[PDB]
Design a protein around this ligand. Structure first.
Ligand SMILES: *[B]([O])([O])[C][N]S(=O)(=O)C1=[C][C]=C(C2=NN=N[N]2)N=[C]1
Length: 358
């Protein structure tokens, strides 16, 4: 690889791994559109399996970028509109608080205080309907952002209803397959289990647990190669041959709401480039990222801005992921680790690498 990339990646990631005690890590840098890969450590400590370019990591909430693009693709297909009431696709949602809550609100965490997590007690479909029927908003729709699996996860489930496909089938046929993400999974098949890293939480090997709306909110697993290809696809949607998927990618990077210096897309979040690094670094800390914040509507949404830092953090109990890219520079990074280590350390490392290469 070019020495500049080798040097800034190793000089940034080596200390990160040591400071954070990360058992295994994979990184891809996309530079002038081409990927360069780096790996360290162990996918499975007990079995002494190294991280490789074929290792599967849990993406956690980086999955929301796939959900947002799949929803964008459904909009481009004419199957749904973000202006549609949630009740168009779920007529059983008859409780009055749902009046005026649209798919846009669900997609962008602005419905009025849907919670981060669906309760673990929700195990059945009827439990899930009860949960949404009984939920009471703290705020009018379109006034406050509260990051939430229960919001964008319901968006993903409703977005695929007109297609008649399951969420997984829709994601496979409409997103994974056309983009040649052939080692990206909502459910890891038995044939791929040899590549599935263990996550590590307090020293214990763990994988993500089943939950309501898991696939839609936090349930994708992928390799560093496929994630590099996901970044390439989001960097340059105009190269994507499938028209609705190209359009869906563009829709997911539109700017729908502003809070502080950040703009909410569908799954993706964006800031103007050049960014103040303290603003994305500090902004990534869950003390800010998970907080309830007033939003300003962008009326109408701004189309995808090329001069953007576009990014998403993700975590499960055992894994920590981060993706960021700048379309105008054809530059991006993916960092996948099998420990959930603090967001700001991820973003700091990503910014150091990308800033040096820009
Ligand atoms: B995303 O920002 O990564 C979602 N984060 S989360 O705190 O809501 C979350 C959901 C599920 C899990 C999980 N780990 N193992 N099983 N489930 N972890 C975090």
């Amino acid at each position: 690889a070019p020495q500049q990339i080798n040097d800034i990646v190793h000089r940034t990631i080596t200390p990160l791994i040591e400071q954070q005690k990360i058992p295994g890590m994979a990184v891809a840098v996309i530079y002038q559109g081409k990927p360069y890969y780096f790996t360290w450590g162990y996918a499975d400590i007990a079995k002494k399996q190294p991280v490789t370019q074929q290792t599967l990591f849990e993406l956690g909430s980086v999955s929301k970028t796939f959900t947002g693009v799949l929803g964008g693709d459904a909009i481009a297909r004419g199957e749904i509109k973000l202006s549609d009431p949630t009740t168009k696709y779920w007529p059983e949602l008859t409780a009055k608080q749902w009046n005026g809550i649209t798919l846009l609100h669900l997609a962008t965490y602005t419905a009025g205080g849907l919670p981060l997590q669906v309760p673990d007690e929700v195990k059945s479909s009827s439990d899930l309907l009860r949960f949404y029927q009984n939920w009471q908003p703290a705020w009018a729709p379109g006034t406050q952002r509260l990051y939430a699996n229960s919001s964008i996860g319901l968006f993903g489930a409703l977005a695929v209803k007109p297609s008649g496909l399951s969420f997984e089938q829709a994601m496979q046929t409409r997103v994974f397959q056309p983009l040649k993400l052939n080692h990206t999974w909502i459910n890891v098949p038995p044939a791929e289990e040899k590549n599935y890293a263990w996550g590590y939480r307090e020293g214990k090997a763990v994988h993500v647990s089943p939950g309501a709306l898991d696939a839609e909110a936090y349930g994708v697993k992928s390799t560093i190669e496929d994630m590099a290809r996901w970044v390439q696809s989001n960097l340059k949607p105009l190269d994507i041959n499938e028209k609705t998927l190209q359009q869906g990618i563009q829709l997911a990077q539109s700017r729908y709401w502003q809070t502080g210096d950040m703009y909410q897309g569908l799954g993706w979040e964006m800031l103007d480039w050049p960014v103040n690094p303290d603003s994305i670094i500090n902004g990534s800390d869950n003390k800010i990222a998970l907080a309830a914040r007033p939003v300003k509507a962008i009326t109408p949404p701004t189309p995808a801005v090329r001069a953007s830092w576009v990014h998403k953090t993700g975590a499960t109990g055992g894994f920590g992921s981060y993706v960021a890219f700048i379309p105008e520079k054809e530059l991006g990074i993916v960092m996948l680790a099998n420990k959930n280590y603090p967001n700001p350390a991820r973003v700091d490392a990503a910014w150091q690498i990308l800033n040096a290469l820009q």
